[PDB]
């Protein structure tokens, strides 16, 4: 497919995912993100545009 289209898909896909997280700005400044707060396919590089 068009690789310009494949990039423009995954910018919108990650923008939907990362805004659904229950993290604030003052909670991720000091404390790191836990590994189990994201899905098991997000951290395995199998995304629905891909």
Swiss-Prot record:
Cellular compartments annotated: Nucleus
Coiled-coil positions: none
Functional description taken from the UniProt entry: Component the THO subcomplex of the TREX complex, which operates in coupling transcription elongation to mRNA export. The THO complex is recruited to transcribed genes and moves along the gene with the elongating polymerase during transcription. THO is important for stabilizing nascent RNA in the RNA polymerase II elongation complex by preventing formation of DNA:RNA hybrids behind the elongating polymerase.
Misc. comment: HPR1 is not required for sporulation, and is not essential for DNA repair. It is probably not a DNA topoisomerase.
Quaternary structure and partners: Component of the THO complex, which is composed of HPR1, MFT1, THO2 and THP2. Together with SUB2, TEX1 and YRA1, THO forms the transcription/export (TREX) complex. THO associates with DNA and RNA in vitro.
Protein name: THO complex subunit HPR1
Organism (species): Saccharomyces cerevisiae (strain ATCC 204508 / S288c) (Baker's yeast)
